[PDB]
């Protein structure tokens, strides 16, 4: 197809930054190589605002940051309408998991219709009451869920965030570390989950052709790929933020990504969480990233057993 | 269908550096070996470096070993020469060439070539001066006029006329290294006297040593 | 039964060499005490006659290196046709995936109508021309399909292998990383394969299952299993010269083995890829090369439960 490609270097603040270099690390395991290779139409718009992250004290943490990034999210879903109205898929690296405000946020615009696949340990899904305090990067959710809104305040930078997506439109996968409010949410507006138990009771397969059920089921919508790198065992992913064990196995995230491009709907993706800060080693961190590189490509097209590249015939000695 | 296309060609001095490209397209690159030669001022063919097909195989001349270093991306189809302490000897023109070994030892496919310059002298634009056409052929049949690119290091300059829209009557001569060691050339132009009245001629000169592209109005004078 | 135990120590160069001490990491890792233990009769032939040059590097890589495979694959091919002839099964320890062309050509001369189960993360169906000279370890079935002939360069050192096996006739598992041609050659000439969707789709169990009813369904025949130490997951098989992540689980593999075992009609079977100079540490070296022992043990029976070694004993101090 056509693919556009967003570089978000987003943060919440030192201890917890380093992730801004996700997307340059992803790029750096050959990313526009490989879906160059697949015959798909690279557009790369760079890096984003990338506010040099102000005095790094202060209460730039409690305002600056979050203000900041609430108004990047808002940039971010401006390229992302704009690129998603001139035709492109939407590849989004991080970064944080907040991006997924925006990305949500301007596939919306054009696409009101959509539905999201959600792959990653956490459900990221709090209010901002429920706050950590260092805040966005996994509450993300709310703002978009369109019955939780009654139940989430007013931020400084947010101001521009209308719900997009209804309860029974987005589905979990990966589901490992969840707080207690989440569960709550989760079980109480009634949005659908499949954990590493549904993975492990019912195979990588069944839970995909139940996603697509639920949301593609009645009725054919571009689909909201955000996938979280810490979904994968953290033996495969050793390079992430909060990393849980029992994580999905290398097989079973191609496996997902193969599903979502057999469907073709696949309107837009996010690749999350990739802090490379994180990894003791520099093979830690290229086998985070090659493991990132590997997911989009998947997802666009690359099916391991050999890509779709035409031959028409073999050379004459 | 099936290209070379050597690049990165440049003015070093010496203890200094320097990196040629080499754009394959046609074939597989990743299928064969390739090869660096260089042809030094009026002498033959001498052989620099090769390197394996697959990758990770490198070969250098006695004269180049552990100052030289081939490699390759053929992800992007790209052999490359990273080239360090150059020496006035390594002057040359260096063409990257596909190794074929189907019987024995043969280079099937080569590039354009491009120059490597170690002189300890300074890359220089040219001046561009109007060559008179003639002051007596200025009534009856035709008359030559022409452009003076001198004072330029090193080679090469380029020139086209009305940006290479008169190419009927058209010469450029090679250059001259003058005894200042600096080279200088002439390209001169064909036309009928009648139409030099009301026909503008501009010759483009363009030196791509100090990326000068110099447009230049030729008429005659009082 | 009896077994017969060949080192092969191939090699493409300095970037692929310690292919050679291949075979030695696998003897060192105890192959022989182990298939001893399984009851099996154990002749060990040695290493076979090398891979090495003189000056090195040169254009002998090109011209003379890859004339010494194809003359080396011949002797090779010659000592299996031997061993074969004998009444043995055929262990060939690599080593390069070509010594595969030699293995599966001896095995042929005696056994005709035998079927390849071909364990790697690779399909190693390239030609020589549409491909580099990188010593054919992705090259070694293109000599040996009867179907890829019009579409094969007669080259230096390879002018005795004639085509032992049909398209329809060898089956590949464990495919991660194809070339666009490769899998060009495997639809286009109807070539069976289950890489590691098809596992996930199915699970091993259905795949062992499809394989034999493919290749033996009709017939009984003597199996030739060519197995690749990359086929498993880099985690597992840290010490190969090109790595595949997404492999098989330890579980899986020794699986394959096993209900290659039970089919009873195992005639030779091929260890390669696991030079272990690419390994980063001695633990990396030993824990591949000890998968490797437990490979070739579970195809000729050692399993979980039982291990073969009936016992009908059923002692009490009455
Ligand atoms: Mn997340
Ligand atoms: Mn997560
Ligand atoms: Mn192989
Ligand atoms: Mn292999």
């Known amino acids: 197809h056509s693919v556009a490609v967003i570089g978000a270097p987003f943060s919440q603040g030192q201890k917890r930054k380093g992730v801004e270099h996700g997307p340059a690390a992803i790029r750096e395991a050959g990313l526009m190589k490989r879906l160059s290779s697949l015959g798909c139409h690279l557009k790369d718009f760079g890096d984003l605002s990338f506010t040099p992250v102000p005095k790094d004290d202060l209460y730039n943490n409690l305002i600056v940051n979050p203000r900041s990034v609430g108004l990047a999210n808002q940039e971010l879903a401006e390229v992302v309408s704009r690129a998603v109205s001139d035709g492109y898929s939407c590849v989004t690296l991080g970064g944080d998991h907040s991006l997924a405000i925006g990305t949500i946020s301007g596939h919306a615009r054009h696409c009101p219709d959509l539905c999201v696949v959600w792959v990653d340990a956490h459900a990221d899904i709090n209010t901002p009451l429920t706050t950590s305090s260092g805040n966005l990067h996994g509450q993300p959710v709310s703002f978009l869920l369109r019955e939780l809104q009654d139940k989430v305040p007013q931020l400084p930078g947010f101001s521009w965030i209308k719900p997009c997506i209804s309860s029974a439109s987005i589905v979990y996968i990966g589901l490992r570390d969840v707080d207690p409010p989440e569960h709550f949410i989760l079980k109480n507006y009634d949005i659908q989950y499949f954990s590493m138990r549904d993975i492990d009771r019912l195979g990588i397969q069944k839970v995909m052709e139940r996603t697509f059920d639920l949301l593609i089921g009645k009725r054919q919508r571009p689909i909201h790929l955000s996938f979280d790198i810490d979904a994968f065992d953290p033996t495969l992913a050793p390079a992430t933020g909060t990393p849980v064990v029992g994580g999905l196995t290398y097989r079973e995230g191609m496996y997902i990504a193969e599903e979502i491009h057999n469907t073709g709907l696949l309107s837009a993706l996010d690749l999350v969480e990739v802090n490379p800060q994180l990894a003791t080693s520099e093979e830690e961190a290229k086998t985070t990233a090659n493991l990132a590189v590997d997911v989009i490509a998947s997802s666009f097209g690359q099916t391991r057993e050999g890509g779709h590249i035409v031959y028409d015939q073999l050379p004459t000695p | 269908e099936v290209q070379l296309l050597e690049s990165g060609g440049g003015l070093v001095q010496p203890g200094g550096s320097l990196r040629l490209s080499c754009a394959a397209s046609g074939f597989t690159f990743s299928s064969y070996a390739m090869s660096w030669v260089r042809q030094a001022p009026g002498k033959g063919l001498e052989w620099v470096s090769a390197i394996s097909g697959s990758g990770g195989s490198t070969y250098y001349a006695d004269s180049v070993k552990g100052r030289f270093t081939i490699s390759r991306d053929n992800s992007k189809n790209t052999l490359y020469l990273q080239m360090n302490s150059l020496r006035a000897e390594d002057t040359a023109v260096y063409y990257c060439?596909?190794?074929?070994?189907?019987?024995?030892?043969?280079?099937?496919?080569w590039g354009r070539g491009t120059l490597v310059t170690v002189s300890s002298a300074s890359t220089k634009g040219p001046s561009v001066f109007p060559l008179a056409p003639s002051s007596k052929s200025t009534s009856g049949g035709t008359a030559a006029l022409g452009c003076l690119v001198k004072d330029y290091f090193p080679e090469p300059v380029t020139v086209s006329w009305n940006s290479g829209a008169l190419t009927s009557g058209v010469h450029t001569f090679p250059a001259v290294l003058q005894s200042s060691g600096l080279y200088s050339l002439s390209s001169v132009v064909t036309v009928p006297s009648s139409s030099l009245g009301t026909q503008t001629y501009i010759c483009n000169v363009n030196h791509k040593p100090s990326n000068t592209k110099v447009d230049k109005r030729v008429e005659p004078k009082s | 039964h009896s077994v017969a135990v060949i080192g092969a120590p191939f090699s493409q160069g300095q970037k692929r060499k310690g292919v050679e001490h291949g075979p030695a990491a696998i003897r060192e890792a105890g192959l022989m005490k182990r298939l001893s233990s399984l009851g099996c009769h154990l002749k060990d032939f040695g290493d076979l006659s090398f891979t090495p040059v003189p000056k090195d590097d040169l254009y002998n890589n090109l011209i003379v290196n890859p004339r010494s495979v194809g003359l080396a694959n011949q002797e090779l091919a010659e000592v299996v046709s031997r061993a074969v002839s004998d009444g043995y099964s055929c262990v060939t320890l690599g080593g390069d995936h070509s010594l595969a062309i030699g293995t599966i050509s001896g095995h042929a001369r005696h056994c005709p109508d035998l079927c390849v189960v071909w364990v790697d993360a690779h399909a190693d169906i390239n030609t020589p021309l549409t491909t580099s000279s990188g010593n054919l370890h992705g090259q070694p079935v293109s000599f040996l399909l009867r179907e890829l002939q019009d579409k094969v360069p007669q080259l230096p050192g390879f002018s005795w292998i004639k085509p032992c096996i049909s398209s329809a006739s060898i089956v590949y598992i464990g495919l991660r990383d194809v070339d666009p041609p490769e899998h060009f050659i495997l639809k286009n000439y109807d070539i069976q394969y289950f890489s590691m969707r098809d596992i996930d789709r199915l699970g091993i169990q259905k795949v062992m299952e499809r394989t034999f009813d493919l290749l033996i369904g009709k017939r009984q025949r003597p199996i030739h299993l060519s197995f690749d130490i990359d086929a498993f997951d880099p985690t597992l098989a840290p010490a190969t010269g090109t790595p595949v992540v997404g492999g098989l689980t330890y579980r899986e593999g020794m699986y394959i083995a096993e209900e290659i075992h039970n089919t009873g009609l195992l005639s030779a079977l091929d260890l390669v890829e696991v030079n272990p100079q690419l390994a980063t540490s001695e633990e990396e070296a030993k824990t591949t090369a000890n998968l490797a022992v437990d490979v070739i043990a579970s195809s000729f029976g050692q399993t979980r439960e039982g291990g073969h070694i009936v016992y009908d004993q059923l002692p009490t101090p009455s």
């Open positions: 060439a596909r190794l074929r070994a189907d019987l024995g030892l043969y280079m099937d496919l």
